[PDB]
Amino acid sequence: HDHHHDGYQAPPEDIALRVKALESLLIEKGLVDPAAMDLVVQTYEHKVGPRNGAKVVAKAWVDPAYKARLLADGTAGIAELGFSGVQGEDMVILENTPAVHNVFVCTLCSCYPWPTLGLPPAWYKAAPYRSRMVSDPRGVLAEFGLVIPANKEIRVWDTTAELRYMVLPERPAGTEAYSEEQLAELVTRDSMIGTGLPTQP
């Protein structure tokens, strides 16, 4: 049982060569600037990632007025913390409640809120998750060790347009008067996709 189509299958043995050849071609024609590309890689390797979303969640947990602004205008709300831009131009924040569990997917490709979560993990972009999330959310969630109560509605949001979604997870019990900082440590990338819950203290 090798990985075949789940996002983690081995690439072709010569892929690095092909990539290097294309890169040189594009530099030689003057289509791309290597120094600029390095800044792009650095941005997504070191500066943009789930910690951003975690601050947004934590702030909404401790600040009701911010939470309301965030839920009314996601893009402006996350911008208050300095997050904005590519693949996050039109954000919609999805609030989990005791009645509703939200989760999102891009069945058609890989659409995901880069400014708050960074680049998507391989599984999010692959056929297993994408195909099954819209038909059997509970079955998929169970594979993540998440069992939603039978009585709790699961809302799956398919990212088919230019809106990007982020889940605002429910605040774990027993975290009274935690600092935003300590709250943010509880917020996993999974809890913001909807495929997990925040850490319980």
Place this chain on the structure above:
Amino acid sequence: MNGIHDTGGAHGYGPVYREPNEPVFRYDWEKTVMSLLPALLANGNFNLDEFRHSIERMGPAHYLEGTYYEHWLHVFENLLVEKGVLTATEVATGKAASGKTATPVLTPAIVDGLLSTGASAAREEGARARFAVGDKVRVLNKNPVGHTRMPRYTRGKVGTVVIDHGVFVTPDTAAHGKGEHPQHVYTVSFTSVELWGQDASSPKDTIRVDLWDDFLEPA
């Protein structure tokens, strides 16, 4: 396009394997491939809709066997040729035909500002909204050979408009040089039963999909 990429509701893809503590980039080559996208979009070598549609048009098996960034790699090698930015020879040989004839639009000085800004698909004006939140709508049965964002599993299905997001570019036309044709995008809610039938469903679960105005009709 009713291709392999439209995976919603498909069976047989198996368990959702997830790598523990997965790095942003699993191989160095992925860094190169990922960073090429913003660089080439900035040049205006193609738009994001033609990009998606290029990935959609790769062979089904190639699509399934290729890791994610091989999809992008395929687009750069093929879409740039179709757009006449490169020739088939340049891409095969790896060597430019006439030296540095272009100038990179994405330079270090604007990288940060460009990534922080992005390019919204929202537009000031476009077709009026035919639907209001709470309206029952049925997704039209359409099977275009070209780029489309109405997933196959929603076609002919009845749901409820639950959000009107405002006016946006229409990818179906923008991918094919037929203009933006801005119109409203709604989030439509479908019940599990409505999409999958009595047996294959759970009574609580709903699925929300973002659809353009003209994908819809009153139910």
